[PDB]
Amino acid sequence: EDPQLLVRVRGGQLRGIRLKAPGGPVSAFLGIPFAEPPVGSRRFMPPEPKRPWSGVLDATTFQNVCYQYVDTLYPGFEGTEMWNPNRELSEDCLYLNVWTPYPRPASPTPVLIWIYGGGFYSGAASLDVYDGRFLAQVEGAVLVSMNYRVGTFGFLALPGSREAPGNVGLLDQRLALQWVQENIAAFGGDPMSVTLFGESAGAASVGMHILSLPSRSLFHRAVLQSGTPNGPWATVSAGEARRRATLLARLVGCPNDTELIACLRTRPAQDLVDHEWHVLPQESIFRFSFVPVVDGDFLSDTPEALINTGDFQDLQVLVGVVKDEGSYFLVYGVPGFSKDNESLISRAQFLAGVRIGVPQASDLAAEAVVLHYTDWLHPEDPTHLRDAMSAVVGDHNVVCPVAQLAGRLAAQGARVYAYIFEHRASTLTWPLWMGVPHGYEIEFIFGLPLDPSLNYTTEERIFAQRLMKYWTNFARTGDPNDPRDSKSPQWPPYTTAAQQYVSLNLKPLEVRRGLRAQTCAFWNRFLPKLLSAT
Amino acid sequence: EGREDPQLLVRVRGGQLRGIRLKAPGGPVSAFLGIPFAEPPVGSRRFMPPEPKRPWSGVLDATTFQNVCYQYVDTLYPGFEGTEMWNPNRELSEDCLYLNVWTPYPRPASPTPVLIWIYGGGFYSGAASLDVYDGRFLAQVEGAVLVSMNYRVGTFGFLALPGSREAPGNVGLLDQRLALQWVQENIAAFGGDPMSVTLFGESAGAASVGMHILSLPSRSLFHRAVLQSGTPNGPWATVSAGEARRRATLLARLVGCPNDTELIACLRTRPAQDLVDHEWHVLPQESIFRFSFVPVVDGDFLSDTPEALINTGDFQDLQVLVGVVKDEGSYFLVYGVPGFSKDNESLISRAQFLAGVRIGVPQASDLAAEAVVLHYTDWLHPEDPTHLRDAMSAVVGDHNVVCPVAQLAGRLAAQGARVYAYIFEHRASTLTWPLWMGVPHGYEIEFIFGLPLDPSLNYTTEERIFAQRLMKYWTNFARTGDPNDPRDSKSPQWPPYTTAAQQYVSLNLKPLEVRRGLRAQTCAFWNRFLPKLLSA
Ligand SMILES: C[N+](C)(C)CCCCCCCCCC[n+]1c(-c2ccccc2)c2cc(N)ccc2c2ccc(N)cc21
Ligand SMILES: C[N+](C)(C)CCCCCCCCCC[n+]1c(-c2ccccc2)c2cc(N)ccc2c2ccc(N)cc21
Ligand SMILES: *[C@@H]1O[C@H](CO[C@@H]2O[C@@H](C)[C@@H](O)[C@@H](O)[C@@H]2O)[C@@H](O)[C@H](O)[C@H]1NC(C)=O
Ligand SMILES: *[C@@H]1O[C@H](CO)[C@@H](O)[C@H](O)[C@H]1NC(C)=O
Ligand SMILES: *[C@@H]1O[C@H](CO)[C@@H](O)[C@H](O)[C@H]1NC(C)=O
Ligand SMILES: [Cl-]
Ligand SMILES: [Cl-]
């Protein structure tokens, strides 16, 4: 045995495993259950806390991945496989993971809680890019990551019903957060300093915890990477959720809510996943079938209303985007795009792409988008049109929604820091035209380049160390700047006045002003006004 | 005759004329001023098409400028050179259809290309006798034969009751056309080549030139054209027959008048000054860069809207030179946008900006106005007074001149014409308007005409060299349809404007510089998006 790998939490004893990190050992407690398996009659229902266990629970291996659709667009392709489940799929998946320095910290250490992305229909805390050993070893951080239900299992809703209230996947995350308040101290973590961070749907999830009162007492700071609670894809109305739920029911042979849900519960998991994608209202990209719902409960109102009228006085937030938020999504549905060629498109393909990229847009609105992104000096140039289609998708779904959030949070009392990540991993396997795709800053924040066997450049390894510092400094103090180091340059807070943000790349920090200011004014101020009349 | 300068006696279709020998910096020039080309359009001729001037007896004296067409006189800034320089400099009268001719002295031995100037003034003012349109420099230095004509403005030249016989509209344009025919028939007597006539004009004059390009009967009277800061298409150069009818009958009511015959007959009994006194009271909304009586789409002179005509016209054998000045809109702001004055910096608030936009784009809906505001707002400093002031200027300039010009250059180029484009960026050292206005509408004219060559005018030496360059460009273009000088490979060339490369040059003290895209993004907003917003 080894007293450093043995811990006692409210539900019982656990035994972790000593793991090897480039510069030393780390303690890892993997696959800890935080809820009763949400199986059988518990499908679609809120999670219940895990009942106490006897003996020493083995926490040396990752638990199962929540049941979800598996990507098959590019079989054998590293670029896609790296996001696919790396453990058995099962509805019994509510487990979390903890990494801590070895030996366990002498004094309470700030805690970082990761919430993965995957459009609310996929993902898992066991993926290699979320490996928390690096942050634990190098920065002495206590890192936690939980699995939460996705797809229909976590978000199918029949608003108002008792058996399928919606947002249970968000409640899974919340329960994991409560578990941290109650047990993290046993691992040397400071429950009084918990920072949530996540990417994409994970970022939107973090945003939702910021906007839901019951979550606010479970964390202190937040980081949203390439994702927000507001925006066109992160939420749906109660009406739209009901529509999709009943439509999915129909597609699988079911059928009063109770009856419908009861029948949905008798169906095999893969049956539900098989039809998940057939409930989307129009042909589109960056749209997901089962996502959080404005239930008037977890979310008292739309994220839009909540961020416009919220008081964020004592909150510190770090937000940012990658250089090419939209490239990735284009190959999943826009005619003319592929990872295998340059994807130089025609102007016609561009107008077609926009209708798919902004599925909710009227013809006039679509026209405005086209006229705004067309480069009138080279209106027919294939390369510009291709890069413009990427920008439309990235701006509409991430950048502008992020600019919007940064602005409201800053205007309403929060301390905000913003960035744009611009370094493309030397090991990226997607084509060059995609630039720095959605999700590729993660491996750097988690510190993977510090693993010699991964073949990153020496520069990349120094870069990752910088980023890890920023994130952990932010977790420690609510300020990413190094408290002691007297000449940086400094990363200034983001404000509505100066709108300052920094570029994260191999070069030293560079301060810039206005995050796609003109273009986001188009998306955030004009387009809305357009559709509410037309 | 007997003792007179034999070089100043000339005969034209209507009779004998005696000109005057004038002095130009580098030598003498011949000037024939105040030649009548039409019967005085007075009394029962008011509002009617011009009739050719009947022959006269004896030697008509053509040594001084004739009357200025009856028009509104600006008094916004009494005593101010900036405004006075455009005011009438001869007696006002409805008897005003006269033209002027400048030629080298002695008159050219072989046929010389002819340049015909058509003045601007929003179709409500102007005169060919203003100092900035003095043709002596172009005649003396480039050996050009320059002609300029007065044409009726305001109600006298554009009030129309479409379909009627007594006030068909566009008579001011017909006055111009009659002067062009007069040139075809008589310019040879002065040594001008009737087979090489280039029309050039600025603002309403440029719009006029554009309308001659779009009206078949005028096409046989000229060969090349220059449009400076103006176009026949755009929001101010024309009105629909319905709108002209409305304005004319409203003006009729305002002066006590009331069937078209009755109305027009009553209008003809009214004193000229009474018509001018109510001219401005017929505009549909509060606005700037909008004029009461302008060319009407009558389905005659203009068979269709200038927009339709430039989109479907064949401009195969046409060479055109077009351009704008650096700050087309500044000037207009002081005539109606609250917060703007020539006497202070005109730093404005964001609220004043939104209000200025409603006045500057008077025909825009609330949604359209918001679109303009959102497009011109600098979101990094949305409240900065200086940027707002400069943005208000840009809105007015782009909507009324720059984008309409870009639209025109594009259609002409795509449809067979040879087009050359420029942006004039030099501010006269002698300008009396405040610095914030930059290079205002109309201030490139004194340079094209060569005034800086006159020592007494106090222009800098560089300005004088600049003027000489411009005169060369314009006359080269008039001679060959190409502004470039064949005997000179050093000076960078001025490339034609094409839909593909969209090249145009900057005209300033520096040597020519080629640029691409004339306000391409912003004009796409005005020319492609705003309209579509309108179709809903
Ligand atoms: C009116 N009505 C609803 C009847 C028809 C209207 C068409 C709207 C649906 C389009 C959804 C966007 C394409 C996504 N899309 C589809 C799909 C869904 C419906 C139609 C065509 C394709 C897909 C389908 C299956 N079975 C399995 C995997 C995938 C898939 C996987 C990943 C991903 N990112 C997108 C995907
Ligand atoms: C529907 N209803 C008729 C009841 C109201 C609509 C009237 C709005 C018209 C505003 C015209 C823009 C200001 C021009 N504007 C006006 C004027 C016209 C109407 C109302 C207020 C001012 C002016 C007035 C007089 N008497 C004499 C000279 C000038 C003037 C002179 C030069 C210039 N460039 C512009 C000028
Ligand atoms: C600039 O001027 C605008 C127009 O006001 C006129 O000019 C000023 C200088 C005074 O002489 C006044 O009597 C005139 O009516 C003003 O509306 C504007 O506020 C002025 N700008 C500022 C803020 O100084
Ligand atoms: C790229 O491949 C896609 C599908 O494989 C195809 O539709 C498109 O035309 C190709 N583009 C190029 C660069 O040829
Ligand atoms: C030109 O300058 C002279 C010398 O100062 C002055 O007497 C004259 O009035 C000026 N004339 C002009 C055009 O301003
Ligand atoms: Cl005016
Ligand atoms: Cl006025």
Short mmCIF file of C-alpha atoms in Angstrom, two decimals, chain A residues 364 367-368 371-379 496-499 513-514 517-518 521-522 525-526 529-530 533-534, chain B residues 366-367 370-371 374-382 499-502 516-517 520-521 524-525 528-529 532-533 536:
data_model
loop_
_atom_site.label_atom_id
_atom_site.label_comp_id
_atom_site.label_asym_id
_atom_site.label_seq_id
_atom_site.Cartn_x
_atom_site.Cartn_y
_atom_site.Cartn_z
CA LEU A 364 -32.42 39.20 -46.68
CA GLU A 367 -27.76 38.45 -48.35
CA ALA A 368 -26.44 40.90 -45.73
CA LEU A 371 -22.36 41.30 -48.86
CA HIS A 372 -20.54 41.89 -45.56
CA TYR A 373 -18.03 39.06 -45.97
CA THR A 374 -17.47 39.36 -49.71
CA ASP A 375 -14.18 41.13 -50.44
CA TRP A 376 -15.35 43.54 -53.14
CA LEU A 377 -11.88 43.80 -54.65
CA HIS A 378 -11.79 40.02 -55.33
CA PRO A 379 -15.49 38.97 -55.20
CA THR A 496 -16.05 48.18 -22.81
CA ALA A 497 -13.98 51.38 -23.17
CA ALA A 498 -10.61 50.04 -24.37
CA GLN A 499 -11.71 46.48 -25.39
CA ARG A 513 -8.01 46.46 -29.19
CA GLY A 514 -11.47 45.56 -30.34
CA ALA A 517 -15.43 45.12 -33.45
CA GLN A 518 -16.96 46.11 -36.79
CA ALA A 521 -21.43 44.93 -34.45
CA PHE A 522 -22.93 43.52 -37.64
CA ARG A 525 -26.48 44.84 -33.29
CA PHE A 526 -27.64 44.85 -36.89
CA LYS A 529 -32.75 44.42 -35.56
CA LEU A 530 -33.14 42.96 -39.01
CA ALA A 533 -39.24 43.34 -38.48
CA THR A 534 -37.47 42.70 -41.84
CA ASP B 366 -35.44 53.67 -39.66
CA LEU B 367 -33.86 50.28 -40.36
CA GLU B 370 -29.60 52.31 -38.38
CA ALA B 371 -27.65 50.32 -40.97
CA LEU B 374 -23.79 50.90 -37.59
CA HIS B 375 -21.60 50.85 -40.70
CA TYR B 376 -20.02 54.27 -40.16
CA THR B 377 -19.64 54.02 -36.39
CA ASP B 378 -16.06 53.26 -35.35
CA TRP B 379 -16.76 50.67 -32.66
CA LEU B 380 -13.42 51.23 -30.94
CA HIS B 381 -14.36 54.88 -30.23
CA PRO B 382 -18.15 55.09 -30.83
CA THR B 499 -14.23 45.86 -63.10
CA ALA B 500 -11.43 43.37 -62.58
CA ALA B 501 -8.65 45.56 -61.15
CA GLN B 502 -10.68 48.68 -60.25
CA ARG B 516 -7.36 49.74 -56.22
CA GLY B 517 -11.02 49.73 -55.29
CA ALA B 520 -15.17 49.10 -52.47
CA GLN B 521 -16.52 47.76 -49.12
CA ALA B 524 -20.99 47.69 -51.78
CA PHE B 525 -23.09 48.64 -48.75
CA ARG B 528 -25.84 46.50 -53.28
CA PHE B 529 -27.19 46.13 -49.78
CA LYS B 532 -32.15 45.25 -51.34
CA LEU B 533 -33.11 46.47 -47.88
CA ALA B 536 -38.88 45.05 -48.14
#
